């Protein structure tokens, strides 16, 4: 079904919380019988004729998206006596990539990481064809369908590109540390398919570091910009980036992987590679690891 009756959505537990709004695990159980399917339901804690307009669009977007590497949309639920709208998506028990990479830091080898990279690239190439920008690409936003299959989640920050432009100016930031975004995003609030690419490079980094805290983007960068005094991090970060400073090669990270990484971090958005050009490059490296 596409429209879920509010009263048949049995709350199970909390899946996650955001700066605003949240996602919880429920089970659609009209009988109470417990044979209803479990789903992932996001809802806003701040309903007003403004952020709802954003949520409305978010729902339409995910609904229009048809990719194996993008969290699947199930329906909506015009909630409890309304303006209490709720987004219903599939539920992926294995959780998000972030924790997965930590729980399985062992079993996971380069080819597998490349596989996830490849699949993420794919779901990203597709989004681009839909004139859409994710804005918040990160390992914490990637979910696991199965051992060899991941998907992109959280489209709460996504933006549809106006027909006449290849970029969007959004004052609202993403939810990850400033070290995940493109310079133009940080200095001029400009996001685009090319900015998604940059953040994709950070994801790559996260994968090959297995989302370790010691060598995470923040950790490496903070211990790299430690300088000036009392200078906002944002300002000192941009400065580092302008000087050619980029994240290092994660320990035991194949050389080639780090080179693609650096490519994604081209100061100029037009110098970064496209997802369609990245995909086959990764597929090579994957088939190169056997
Ligand atoms: C660390 N990141 C959060 C982990 C957790 O809650 C979040 C907030 C975030 O995951 C994208 N989350 C969403 C946010 C916006 C739209 C959809 C989701 C979402 C979704 C799921 C999900 C899960 C968890 N989180 C999930 C989700 C962790 C435990 C495994 C399942 C899910 O299974 N499908 C949609």
The 3-class secondary structure across the chain, one letter per residue, is CCECCHHHEEEEEEEEECCCCEEEEEEECCCCCCCCCEEEEEECCCCCCCHHHHHHHHHHHHHHCCCCCECCEEEECCCCCCCCCEEEECCCCCCEHHHHHHHCCCCCCHHHHHHHHHHHHHHHHHHHHCCEECCCCCHHHEEEEECCEEEECCCCCCEECCCCCCEEECCCCCCCCHHHCCHHHHHHCEEEHHHHHHHHHHHHHHHHHCCCCCCCHHHHHHHHHCCCCCCCHHHHHHHHHHCCCCCCCCCCCCHHHHHHHHHHCCCCHHHCCCHHHHHHHHHHHHHCCC
Q: Is 4 in the pocket of ligand 1 (CB under 6 A)?
A: no
Separation between Cα atoms, residue 242 and residue 261, nearest integer Å: 17
**Among 204, 200, 180, CA closest to 256:** 204
Report the structure determination method: X-ray
Residues of the chain with CATH 3.30.200.20: 1-91
Q: Which atom of ligand 1 is nearest to the CA of 98?
A: 1
For the record, the structure tokens of 186 come out as 């940080």
Q: Is 157 in the pocket of ligand 1 (CB under 6 A)?
A: no
- The alpha carbon of 110 is separated from its chain's Cα centroid by a whole number of angstroms, namely 21
Q: Is 179 annotated as a binding residue?
A: no
Separation between Cα atoms, residue 48 and residue 21, nearest integer Å: 13
Look up the CATH number of domain 1-91: 3.30.200.20
Q: Is 71 in the pocket of ligand 1 (CB under 6 A)?
A: yes
What is the structure's resolution, reported in angstroms to one decimal? 2.5
Half-sphere exposure of 70 (CA within 13 A, CB side): 21
User: Burial, 271: exposed, middle or buried (Cβ in 10 Å; 0-12, 13-18, 19+)?
Assistant: exposed
Residues of the chain with CATH 1.10.510.10: 92-287
How many residues does the structure list for the chain? 290
Parallel, antiparallel or unpaired: strands 86-89 and 167-169: unpaired
**Among 154, 155, 191, CA closest to 172:** 191
Residue located nearest, by CA, to atom 30 of ligand 1: 95
Q: Is 153 in the pocket of ligand 1 (CB under 6 A)?
A: yes
Question: 152 CA distance to ligand 1 centroid (A)?
Answer: 10
Inter-residue contact 16 to 34 (CB < 8 Å): no
Separation between Cα atoms, residue 214 and residue 221, nearest integer Å: 11
Dihedral, CA of residue 278, residue 101, residue 176 and residue 226, to nearest 10: -100
Active-site amino acid positions: 136
The sign of the torsion formed by the CA atoms of 84, 24, 151, 154 equals positive
Separation between Cα atoms, residue 282 and residue 289, nearest integer Å: 11
Separation between Cα atoms, residue 273 and residue 280, nearest integer Å: 12
Residue located nearest, by CA, to atom 5 of ligand 1: 16
Separation between Cα atoms, residue 14 and residue 23, nearest integer Å: 7
Question: 107 CA distance to ligand 1 centroid (A)?
Answer: 23
Q: Which residue has the tokens 């540390």?
A: 177
β partners of residue 76: 3, 87
Which superfamily, per CATH, for 92-287? Transferase(Phosphotransferase) domain 1 (1.10.510.10)
Q: Which residue has the tokens 């975004």?
A: 181
Question: 110 CA distance to ligand 1 centroid (A)?
Answer: 25
Q: Which atom of ligand 1 is nearest to the CA of 140?
A: 1
Inter-residue contact 200 to 125 (CB < 8 Å): no
């Amino acid at each position: 079904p596409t429209i879920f009756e509010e009263r048949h959505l049995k709350y199970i537990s909390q899946l996650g919380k955001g700066n605003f709004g949240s996602v919880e695990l429920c089970r659609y159980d009209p009988l109470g019988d417990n044979t209803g399917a479990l789903v992932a339901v996001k809802q806003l804690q701040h309903s007003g004729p403004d952020q709802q307009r954003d949520f409305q669009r978010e729902i339409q977007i995910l609904k229009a998206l048809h990719s194996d590497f993008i969290v699947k949309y199930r329906g909506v639920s015009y909630g409890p006596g309304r303006p209490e709208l709720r987004l219903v998506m599939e539920y992926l028990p294995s959780g998000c990539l972030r924790d997965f990479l930590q729980r399985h830091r062992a079993r996971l080898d380069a080819s597998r990481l490349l596989l996830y990279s490849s699949q993420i690239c794919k779901g990203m190439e597709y989004l681009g064809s839909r004139r859409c920008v994710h804005r918040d690409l990160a390992a914490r936003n990637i979910l696991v369908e199965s051992e060899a299959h991941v998907k992109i989640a959280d489209f709460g920050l996504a933006k549809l590109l106006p027909l006449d432009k290849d970029y969007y100016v959004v004052r609202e930031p993403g939810q990850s540390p400033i070290f995940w975004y493109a310079p133009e995003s940080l200095s001029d609030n400009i996001f685009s398919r090319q900015s998604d690419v940059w953040s994709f490079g950070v994801v790559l980094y996260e994968l090959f570091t297995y989302c370790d805290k010691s060598c995470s983007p923040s950790a490496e960068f903070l211990r790299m910009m430690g300088c000036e005094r009392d200078v906002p991090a944002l300002c000192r970060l941009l400065e580092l980036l302008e000087e050619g400073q980029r994240l290092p090669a994660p320990p035991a990270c194949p050389a080639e992987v780090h080179e693609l990484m650096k490519l994604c971090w081209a100061p100029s958005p037009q110098d970064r590679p496209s997802f369609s050009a990245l995909g086959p490059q990764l597929d090579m490296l994957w088939s190169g690891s056997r």
